[PDB]
Design a protein around this ligand. Sequence first.
Ligand SMILES: Nc1ncnc2c1ncn2[C@H]1C[C@H](O)[C@@H](COP(=O)(O)OP(=O)(O)OP(=O)(O)O)O1
Ligand SMILES: [Ca+2]
Ligand SMILES: [Mn+2]
Length: 430
Amino acid sequence: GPHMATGQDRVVALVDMDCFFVQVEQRQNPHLRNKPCAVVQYKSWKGGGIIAVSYEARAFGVTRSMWADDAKKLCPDLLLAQVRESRGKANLTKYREASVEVMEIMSRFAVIERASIDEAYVDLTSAVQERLQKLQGQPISADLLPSTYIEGLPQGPTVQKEGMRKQGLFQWLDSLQIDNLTSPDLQLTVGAVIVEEMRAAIERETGFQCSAGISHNKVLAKLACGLNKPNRQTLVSHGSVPQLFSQMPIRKIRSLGGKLGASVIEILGIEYMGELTQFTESQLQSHFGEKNGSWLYAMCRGIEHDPVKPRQLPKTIGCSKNFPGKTALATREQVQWWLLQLAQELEERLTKDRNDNDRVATQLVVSIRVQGDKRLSSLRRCCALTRYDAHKMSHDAFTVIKNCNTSGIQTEWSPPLTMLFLCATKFSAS
DNA sequence: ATTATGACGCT
DNA sequence: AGCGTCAT
Ligand SMILES: Nc1ncnc2c1ncn2[C@H]1C[C@H](O)[C@@H](COP(=O)(O)OP(=O)(O)OP(=O)(O)O)O1
Ligand SMILES: [Ca+2]
Ligand SMILES: [Mn+2]
């Protein structure tokens, strides 16, 4: 009862860019705006691989991971923008720089945690408190929430989508108790007002649209964000959780989309997140471990305590390339040339990072894959990163991997390498 | 031949 | 440390 924690202590948002790489290309090339279009990397093999898809193109069934030649079968008028190639490889610099544009705007409102190239968590608890006091107990007008959905509403006692949105928003606002400054529902609502402001700022200052989730923790905020995309935001209240989770496949919750989630389903014989409430914490810990068990017990009740970490910059800077099928590297000269290409991109990015962010990487991680292994990485080795010099880094990378070569002949490389990966890690202030 | 990343957990 | 998982 009264001592039962409800995980309503924080206001957390997740802001995620809509079809991000496509918007970056659409800003650059107005011919692509408001069109079925996708971003592709490489081209020779099956037209290139799609990595981002506009919502117009999704209507035709175009998806990520599709070959462009195959996407064209679904959508003959599909427009394409290609990822830049430098030093023989895809180069994602344009999108990383566009990401920084957005992250720096978000950071004006609150502490953010960079969660991917196109999304960040926001801890809005303090900002909400401040806005609540400037608000002096006045009601919140629907006009302040023009793109907000309230998950679970409307309910009870109609045709258009925007009509439904407003109906639900009005039910929510009509029920709000605005003279309690510690009401979690009110806090979420004020959070949503701030996120409208944040999203407007992002669009005004970059041209990019985004969606957002507002809830009491990161997992619910992420889930919320996806419920109404694109260009909308969704508030998931604590009270909405039992109905929301009652038909929510376990795999939809962040961290449960893989083997652990499959094991929860198989071992317990359930399908939906809500069904987890019928197990004791000890039961869940017995199957999934102490940490996962406790996390699942709380999470299926809408409760999670993972903090929004104050980190805007990536912790590592890496460069990787696959060499599939017959392109697998089979000579020492090949392996060395590509290590140099990777190292040259890495040096460029590291040198910029040092100037921008007052830090230096101190460790170089080298990873490779060998033909026939279908693990992502076959082998990882580290060495000291003491100078931002591509020839040195590529020589050092070669040194730590050269013994992987089972070939008798020095020139030849066996078994052929199907992936190379250089990663700069362990940053120190500089 | 579903590529190029990036964070965090386990032992 | 080196490997595995999950993610976008
Ligand atoms: N598996 C991947 N491989 C390479 N790049 C990816 C992959 N997944 C995502 N990206 C890139 C391209 C995306 O535009 C960008 C952001 O990803 P993501 O948020 O999942 O989708 P999205 O922004 O393209 O559309 P959405 O509107 O559904 O969020 O990151
Ligand atoms: Ca996105
Ligand atoms: Mn994303």
